[PDB]
Amino acid sequence: MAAQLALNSEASLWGPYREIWQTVLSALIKRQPEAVHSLDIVLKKYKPDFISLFKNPPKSAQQHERVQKASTEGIPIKGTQRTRILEEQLIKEAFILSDLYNIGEIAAVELLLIGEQQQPTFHGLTRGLVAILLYWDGKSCMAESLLHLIQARKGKTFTLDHSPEVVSMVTRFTDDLMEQGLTNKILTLISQIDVNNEFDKLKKERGLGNKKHRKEVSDLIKECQQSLAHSLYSWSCQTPLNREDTLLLIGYLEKVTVEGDGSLDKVNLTLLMSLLYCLDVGFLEQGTDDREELMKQASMFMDRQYIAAIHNRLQNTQPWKSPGMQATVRLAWALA
Amino acid sequence: LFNIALFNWLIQADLTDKLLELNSPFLEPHLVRMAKLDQNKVRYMDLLWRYYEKNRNFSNAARVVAKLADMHSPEISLKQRLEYISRAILSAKSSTTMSTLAADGEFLHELEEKLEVARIQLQIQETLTRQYSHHSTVGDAVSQLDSQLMDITKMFGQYADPFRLSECKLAIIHCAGHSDPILVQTLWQDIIDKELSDSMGNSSVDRMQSLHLKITSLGKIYASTPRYFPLEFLVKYLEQQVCNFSWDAGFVTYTMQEINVPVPKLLEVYDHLFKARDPWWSRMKKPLHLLESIYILLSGYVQEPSKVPSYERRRFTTLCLDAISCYLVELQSMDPAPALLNTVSNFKSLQAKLERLS
């Protein structure tokens, strides 16, 4: 019987992600000893969501037929032993949300039912407009959970006074995520997420609310991009990226442009800082006694090809879209 | 019925990768059922853990592979059991990074201890096959060592003791945390005496090199744990062998430095051995031998002062000057022989070089 309850567990896009974030905050930021046991259970349970990062549950012809028959046969929803009959309006809204975000029809129904439950906190919005906020809030909670897990790893810069057991658990969990190509996923997501493209999708289906709702959706999207960029930054501050991930970050910054005032935007400034921290060697100046052990931990001294690969990439190549940003990385490399 | 026939056909056709691509909810119950009922239990457990690893169920993968490693079977060699334990550890580490359960940490520690015990078991097996291949009981002993993972107590009493495997006995007592200083000294003596016996057909230089490689290899394992590396006994015993075989007096000092024994700690041992005034050295007509070894050790420090950490170098040079002053006073109390006058000259030259380093 537990396996049929587990199969509906994977369909919810907000409630579980908010529970993950609250557990991560309570264990790592608030240092609550009771929350550490809950953190281990949550990290083991939702490891596939962190590995897949922002991946939506896929559409299914069996889910489509069930949601279409839900006005007569009823659907089993999470937490309820009884099938619930769904209104024809909610069934139509679920197909619109399923088409908009390419999510499974049960996940769209669950997100709308949570959006109907939260409709009193979001006054003047329809359940579908609230479901759009909760969709991006759930992605924000997953990105912030990843950021705080990376900050609480063993490294050089952020010292969160945690027990060695929690630090070891979080470090093992976050190492397993990096081996699954976390850097390439983050840079791909930051490239794909655009407020204008999302507003054009929402505008086609009339999913744009009042001036406040447009701001809240824009702010949640920008937070997701910023927390993802901070995740790579906070990583690079704790431990220097490997040869392949450093080359991916360089290959992203090659394509970046400056704002209309001549400044870098928040996300690209953070990613430039991530690369500048990957190029930091001044920990070699600050101690005589731990010097050999710190040299053994730095990725630049572990891989004999790291220096040659980065040097050749900065020496032999096409002008970046921002020549000044290329010049900053070359100066940092020359000093390194 | 159809899914069972398809799975059995894919298994019979050796299409294991395609079977593991089938996201069928009936595959796991089928593999678990077949791993309980079928004679080919190994093969179905192998498919079952690969299915769990592919589905990122690392806790269940680790438990199936640990159970494969513990399973009494002549079909699973000790080398394959070690591969299974190593894979169980890799899966358990992947799970503990995701899971804060104390039970996943305890299980990981049990697997790490079991891997160490199983490596000693493999060392016994490989030593029996290499050194006792002609002994009638070794075929049976090797097959028993493949058939299951053994407890340390059984490995000691049934294999390491009857076959006089002093290196394996030392590894066993290290792994068990059992500390008997007399037993540790006896085991090191047996290892040295065996290496000296096995090399009796070789040149004096090849015998010296064989013993050096042996003592350096074991010394690098045990020198971090003083309970299993009786440095004073080892230095004394090896210096007695250097005298017995008329080897280079530098041999013990060089071998201990290659093990990473600190020069100050090695000097403390030689100073103690010299001050102990053991009648053995006079009986062997080599009363200056320990002072020759001290001179070689300290000459090596004077040539390369980086062998001593910079923060203790000044203190250590002063300790050497005080020690040399004591050795020179004792040498003046002995009968004037040409060898003694040379030793006194060497220590005065060494003193004048150490005064330039202070």
Side-chain angles (χ1 to χ4, degrees):
Chain A
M1 274 184 182
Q4 274 179 341
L5 278 159
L7 252 147
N8 282 3
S9 83
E10 296 180 350
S12 187
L13 287 168
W14 180 74
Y17 296 160
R18 195 161 179 139
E19 286 172 6
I20 293 163
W21 179 64
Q22 286 179 345
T23 307
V24 172
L25 284 179
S26 304
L28 303 180
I29 305 199
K30 308 184 180 180
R31 304 179 184 188
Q32 293 181 346
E34 303 180 354
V36 176
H37 186 64
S38 300
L39 182 66
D40 185 37
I41 295 170
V42 169
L43 291 180
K44 284 170 179 158
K45 182 182 174 195
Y46 299 108
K47 191 174 184 176
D49 292 280
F50 283 105
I51 290 170
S52 65
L53 194 67
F54 288 18
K55 191 176 181 181
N56 290 337
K59 295 189 182 189
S60 171
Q62 294 182 359
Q63 292 185 356
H64 196 89
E65 282 188 353
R66 283 177 183 177
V67 175
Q68 193 176 21
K69 292 179 180 181
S71 58
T72 55
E73 294 179 0
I75 282 181
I77 300 157
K78 266 185 177 178
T80 337
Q81 290 183 354
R82 292 184 178 183
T83 51
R84 193 176 178 181
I85 297 173
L86 300 179
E87 297 181 351
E88 288 191 356
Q89 293 184 0
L90 186 148
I91 294 170
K92 289 174 186 173
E93 289 177 5
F95 295 137
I96 295 167
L97 266 156
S98 180
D99 289 340
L100 185 74
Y101 293 123
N102 193 33
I103 62 170
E105 293 86 347
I106 296 178
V109 168
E110 286 190 353
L111 187 66
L112 279 170
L113 288 170
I114 298 168
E116 181 174 14
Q117 287 174 352
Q118 293 296 337
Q119 202 179 5
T121 57
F122 296 100
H123 280 301
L125 302 185
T126 57
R127 70 176 113 218
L129 293 177
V130 182
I132 291 155
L133 289 174
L134 299 174
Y135 179 75
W136 283 105
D137 190 53
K139 297 294 179 182
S140 195
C141 292
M142 281 297 293
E144 286 299 339
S145 299
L146 178 65
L147 173 58
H148 298 321
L149 286 166
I150 292 168
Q151 288 171 334
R153 153 182 288 117
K154 185 180 180 181
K156 300 178 184 184
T157 43
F158 312 92
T159 53
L160 303 173
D161 296 314
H162 293 328
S163 74
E165 296 178 356
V166 173
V167 178
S168 180
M169 182 191 299
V170 173
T171 302
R172 286 176 182 180
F173 179 82
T174 48
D175 285 343
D176 288 351
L177 292 181
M178 187 58 78
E179 290 186 358
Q180 297 290 331
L182 184 61
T183 308
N184 192 16
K185 287 170 181 159
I186 290 174
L187 295 175
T188 299
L189 286 172
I190 295 170
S191 305
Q192 284 178 3
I193 296 166
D194 174 10
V195 180
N196 294 315
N197 290 329
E198 290 303 320
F199 275 35
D200 278 339
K201 288 175 188 171
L202 289 173
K203 188 177 177 185
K204 285 172 184 178
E205 298 305 328
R206 306 181 179 188
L208 287 172
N210 67 13
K211 299 182 185 178
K212 180 177 169 174
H213 176 255
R214 295 179 193 184
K215 180 181 171 188
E216 290 170 330
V217 176
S218 179
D219 290 347
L220 287 171
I221 290 169
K222 285 171 182 173
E223 284 168 9
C224 290
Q225 292 178 307
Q226 192 56 35
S227 318
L228 284 176
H230 278 291
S231 295
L232 281 179
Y233 169 69
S234 292
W235 186 289
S236 68
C237 297
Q238 292 295 31
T239 49
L241 293 175
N242 68 41
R243 183 181 57 71
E244 298 186 355
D245 289 328
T246 308
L247 287 171
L248 287 173
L249 183 59
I250 290 169
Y252 183 96
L253 292 174
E254 272 175 9
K255 300 174 187 170
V256 173
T257 50
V258 190
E259 287 289 328
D261 66 349
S263 75
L264 289 171
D265 69 303
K266 285 180 176 194
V267 177
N268 293 314
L269 179 62
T270 304
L271 292 176
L272 175 62
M273 296 307 304
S274 316
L275 182 60
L276 290 179
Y277 268 100
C278 296
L279 304 185
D280 193 13
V281 265
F283 66 87
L284 298 175
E285 294 190 341
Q286 285 185 344
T288 49
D289 297 0
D290 288 341
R291 194 172 176 181
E292 285 190 0
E293 201 160 16
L294 287 170
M295 280 189 190
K296 285 173 184 166
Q297 288 177 15
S299 307
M300 294 206 195
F301 299 111
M302 287 292 288
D303 179 7
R304 286 186 175 181
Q305 298 184 4
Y306 187 99
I307 300 178
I310 300 302
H311 189 84
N312 283 324
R313 191 67 167 125
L314 295 176
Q315 191 180 17
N316 277 338
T317 54
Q318 293 176 348
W320 295 14
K321 289 198 197 157
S322 178
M325 183 160 33
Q326 193 179 36
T328 300
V329 178
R330 285 179 177 135
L331 181 64
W333 187 237
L335 295 171
Chain B
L1 293 174
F2 181 79
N3 292 333
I4 296 171
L6 178 63
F7 301 154
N8 288 352
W9 179 80
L10 286 170
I11 295 170
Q12 285 175 358
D14 213 38
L15 294 174
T16 61
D17 297 319
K18 295 184 185 174
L19 181 72
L20 297 174
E21 286 175 359
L22 298 175
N23 289 340
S24 187
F26 305 104
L27 180 59
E28 171 186 354
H30 183 64
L31 292 178
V32 172
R33 180 179 179 179
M34 294 306 291
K36 288 178 182 182
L37 296 177
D38 202 292
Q39 292 180 352
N40 296 308
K41 175 170 174 204
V42 184
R43 191 180 188 196
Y44 291 102
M45 286 188 173
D46 269 320
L47 292 171
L48 184 64
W49 75 256
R50 290 179 186 199
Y51 174 82
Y52 290 142
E53 192 183 36
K54 186 174 182 171
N55 291 334
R56 301 186 170 204
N57 191 343
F58 301 114
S59 189
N60 285 348
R63 291 174 187 229
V64 173
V65 182
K67 188 175 185 173
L68 273 170
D70 289 328
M71 182 168 67
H72 183 79
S73 181
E75 300 180 346
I76 309 175
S77 64
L78 184 57
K79 292 187 177 187
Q80 287 166 317
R81 296 175 185 284
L82 284 168
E83 289 173 9
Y84 289 142
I85 299 163
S86 301
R87 180 64 62 152
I89 290 166
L90 288 171
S91 302
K93 286 182 180 183
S94 303
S95 194
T96 53
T97 307
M98 298 181 65
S99 173
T100 60
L101 294 175
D104 291 331
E106 184 178 8
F107 178 62
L108 176 61
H109 285 307
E110 190 197 334
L111 290 176
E112 287 181 333
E113 289 182 352
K114 189 177 294 181
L115 183 63
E116 190 62 10
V117 175
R119 283 169 174 174
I120 295 171
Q121 196 174 325
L122 180 67
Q123 187 185 0
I124 291 168
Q125 187 189 59
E126 291 184 342
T127 303
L128 290 178
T129 304
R130 185 177 64 216
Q131 292 182 354
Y132 299 88
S133 57
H134 302 301
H135 198 327
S136 53
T137 54
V138 168
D140 294 337
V142 169
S143 70
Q144 287 176 12
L145 290 165
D146 277 321
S147 73
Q148 63 188 351
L149 299 176
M150 296 188 186
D151 178 41
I152 300 178
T153 316
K154 292 182 181 176
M155 284 197 276
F156 190 87
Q158 299 185 352
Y159 305 90
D161 196 56
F163 295 96
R164 303 183 179 183
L165 305 183
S166 303
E167 295 183 28
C168 298
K169 291 182 180 188
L170 184 61
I172 284 167
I173 64 175
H174 177 266
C175 182
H178 184 261
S179 176
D180 175 353
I182 298 176
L183 178 61
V184 171
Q185 288 178 20
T186 303
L187 291 177
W188 273 105
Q189 204 190 295
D190 289 342
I191 292 164
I192 290 164
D193 290 347
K194 182 174 180 172
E195 186 63 40
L196 288 172
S197 69
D198 289 356
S199 66
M200 279 194 297
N202 299 341
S203 82
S204 193
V205 180
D206 299 321
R207 292 181 74 209
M208 187 180 69
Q209 188 63 20
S210 206
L211 186 65
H212 171 73
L213 290 175
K214 179 59 62 172
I215 298 300
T216 297
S217 72
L218 295 175
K220 284 175 180 168
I221 300 165
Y222 300 113
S224 55
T225 313
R227 292 190 292 269
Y228 304 100
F229 190 74
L231 176 65
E232 187 183 333
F233 170 82
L234 289 174
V235 172
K236 184 178 180 172
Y237 193 66
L238 292 169
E239 288 291 17
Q240 290 175 343
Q241 301 308 334
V242 168
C243 279
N244 289 339
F245 297 111
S246 302
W247 292 348
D248 182 4
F251 171 78
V252 185
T253 69
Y254 175 78
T255 303
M256 293 299 163
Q257 281 173 87
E258 190 174 331
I259 291 162
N260 312 286
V261 181
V263 179
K265 186 61 186 173
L266 188 57
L267 182 65
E268 187 196 334
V269 168
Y270 276 110
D271 183 65
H272 189 76
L273 290 177
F274 177 69
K275 287 173 178 167
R277 297 180 179 190
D278 190 331
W280 188 102
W281 307 109
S282 298
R283 184 173 63 216
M284 291 297 291
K285 305 180 179 178
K286 292 289 189 167
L288 303 178
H289 183 72
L290 295 180
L291 287 176
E292 187 172 6
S293 303
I294 289 163
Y295 169 76
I296 293 167
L297 179 63
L298 294 183
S299 294
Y301 169 58
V302 167
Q303 287 175 359
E304 191 176 73
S306 46
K307 291 183 173 188
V308 179
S310 54
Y311 66 79
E312 65 175 12
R313 193 182 293 147
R314 183 175 180 162
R315 182 180 68 124
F316 184 59
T317 301
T318 304
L319 288 168
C320 297
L321 289 170
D322 294 334
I324 290 171
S325 300
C326 291
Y327 305 149
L328 284 172
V329 172
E330 293 204 340
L331 283 169
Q332 286 170 15
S333 75
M334 299 179 80
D335 292 315
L340 183 131
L341 295 176
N342 191 48
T343 302
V344 171
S345 187
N346 284 348
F347 275 104
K348 286 180 179 182
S349 181
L350 185 67
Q351 185 174 16
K353 292 172 187 176
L354 283 164
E355 287 173 356
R356 295 173 186 187
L357 287 171
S358 62

